[PDB]
Amino acid sequence: VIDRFDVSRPELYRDDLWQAPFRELRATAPVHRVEHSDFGPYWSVSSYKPIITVESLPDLYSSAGGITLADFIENNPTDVRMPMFIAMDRPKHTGQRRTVAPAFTPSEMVRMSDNIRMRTAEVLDSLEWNTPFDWVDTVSVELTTQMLAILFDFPWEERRKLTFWSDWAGDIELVKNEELRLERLRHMYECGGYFQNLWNAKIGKPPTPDLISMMIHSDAMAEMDQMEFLGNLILLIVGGNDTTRNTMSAVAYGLDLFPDQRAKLEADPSMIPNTVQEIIRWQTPLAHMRRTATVDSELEGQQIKAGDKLALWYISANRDESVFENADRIIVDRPNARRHLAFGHGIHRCVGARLAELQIAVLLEEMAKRRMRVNVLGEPERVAACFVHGYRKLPVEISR
Ligand code: HEM
Ligand SMILES: CCCCCCCCCCCC
């Protein structure tokens, strides 16, 4: 079987073959049912306009029946079910989004701007020139995970624990990478235990920004307790680390493919902010999110039935030629670059978007300060998944 339009296949992303099928799907079937399968049947929502209309309709297309193409996958007593306010609806969703959003008030960005800058500086000065190395590990991960260590508190030493994402379950819960039942789950419990210790370490003092803090001593009018954790902090971890990483990893890789557009940026640091957006578009650190139809419905032609599983391929959206012409080129001056769907749309749009915008900016700032230019050597070891989207290894050196 090569459904071709079964764009679930982790092959396409690892090997970088997703461009053509999603080029056709847009031009002849932007809403298309993949009957079978790999994950079970889905609806490939593959274009810009249609996505928006799904995400602006939280009743017709729920977030509280799973949010990636993976499912609950079990009957009755094997418990599981890890809550997450990204996987919520109705009012409760707005309840809990309230209780983390103040971490990303632009004044908090200004407060954290100065620390972020020291660590971005400090990292880039450890780097040596023309000697090869791994952009992913030495920069994109190393920074990124620092940031998540400050958003919780670890503190510092052994913060590499936060690199237990292993949540590429867009391709891990599908006949088991690890048998699973006491593996990704046990990896997740050993996390939760550790964070429970951190929750009990903070039941004195005021709000110490986010780091549990914000879930309690900073009011938290609801957001009680009761293993929301494996869930909410699963969410927070992945959001606050992996997404940014693959972007930093993409600034090195991406720009280098389009070295003229890089040189213009190199010349003009006022381009930076639009550069950040343009890059976040390009990459789409999460290629897709899924909704689930609660009642029967019409959508761009197609006939969605209560039960059906939707699948919003931002990855293809951000290359919709209706909106961004020559989308498969990085163009750092591209005006509308800010209108990408990588952070998403509607009431779920990434609450951390301003922080990721900062982390990247400062990288490209601290880089300009230094006259860097990252030169990619081999091709990168990509991730194999429909959900996460970037790089496990990037081989580079730096010049001037
Ligand atoms: C380049 C960086 C990032 C990208 C591409 C990204 C992407 C996304 C996307 C696509 C969603 C779902 C959007 C939707 O349904 O409309 C989302 C939700 C979320 N992201 Fe991010 N994200 C990023 C950074 C962050 C950071 C830094 C944090 C936290 C510190 C974070 C926390 C979240 C949270 C909490 C949600 C769920 C919000 C809700 O309930 O609607 N993200 N993110
Ligand atoms: C079981 C696989 C789905 C869970 C993946 C973690 C939650 C995704 C949050 C996205 C970060 C913004």
Structure, briefly:
The protein has 400 residues and is an alpha+beta fold.
Named once each, the bound ligands are: protoporphyrin IX containing FE, dodecane
Radius of gyration: 21 Å
Architecture in CATH?
Answer: Orthogonal Bundle
- Tell me roughly what share of residues is in helical segments: 25-40%
How widely separated are the two ends?
A: 49 Å
CATH superfamily: Cytochrome P450
CATH class category:
Mainly Alpha
Structural class: alpha+beta
How much strand content do the residues show? 5-15%
- Tally the beta strands: 13
Query: What's the multimeric state?
Result: monomer
Number of helices: 13
Major sheet description: 4 strands, mixed
Provide the number of structural domains: 1
- So what's the overall shape? globular
Order of strands side by side in the largest beta sheet?
1-2-9-5
Task: Explain what the structure shows.
It is built from 13 helices and 13 strands. With 400 residues, the chain is an alpha+beta fold. The protein has one domain (1-400): Orthogonal Bundle (Cytochrome p450). The strands form five sheets. A four-stranded mixed beta sheet has the order 1-2-9-5. Helix 11 (272-283) crosses helix 13. The chain is globular. Dodecane binds next to helix 8.
